[PDB]
Amino acid sequence: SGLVPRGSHMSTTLAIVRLDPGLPLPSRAHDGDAGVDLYSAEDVELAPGRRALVRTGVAVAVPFGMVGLVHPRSGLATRVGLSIVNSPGTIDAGYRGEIKVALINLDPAAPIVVHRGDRIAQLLVQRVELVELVEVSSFDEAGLASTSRGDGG
Template identity: 35%
Template sequence: MPYPMKYWLRLPLSGGSAWKAVTRAWIAMSSYVIMPASAMTRRMKIKLIDFGVPEDRRPFRPHGNDVGADVYIPYDCTLQPGRIAKVPLGLGIEVPGGYAGYVFPRASMAEKGLVCELPPVDSGYREEIHAIISNISSQTQELSKGSRVGQLVIPRLSADFVSELGKQRGTDGF
């Protein structure tokens, strides 16, 4: 057995005992590497550039396993229906090559009709970051100073854009 039992993939199995035996055998022989969660978590340090953000309003991950860090609005803002606000966050970031930063919408704001647009913060950008907030509701929305307006997420991006892929794909897709 290549991995201790506690790291094996466990699925709810249905059907007869023969189905369970076949499924367990397939899981044990599969080519997937099953690792403990602690082996998959890596922290990356991102340098903040201060554009006037107060110490208590810097990006903050409330829980250690959160993907995004909360970002805050620095002043009161009223957003009319169908309007867009470009809200400076008082900070910049130095994103390493191969990564980009995005201010994702918070679920509590999105359910009110306030969503953050997702322009990327590229690795070479060193200016102040803004949250681009759209009011897609039919009501005027009030944002209070110090409210969490989004979550700063920094995913790794990997893509090569080519003119030829080498293999012709079918035309039956959408």
């Protein structure tokens, strides 16, 4: 329906330009899914170990105070070793260019064929803290020293 539901009265609008209108709008595969699936605008073959920067045919306007995040899909990751070099890719609120996906073939022997119209990644949108750094001479200064860890990870 065109009626915005009760709880979800503050659902976030994402403006999108289909730079390649031959591709469907990105969509959630199932209700409640965190991401919308991005399509490839191109046919690409990746030999083992090779990477490509693949156009998705879309540009978005992530709201200020938020971030878009490009995540790999789990099925292709396991079945053929498809990954994303810079995962999770960070799409900034001021970016108005085309979203591109840095696919890489992490299989040792079998090439990966991507066809135009395949779903090759997923886009999440989340709030981000735009932090103000405060340089301190030590954490005790800031009142932040004794912790559950310390300088240990």
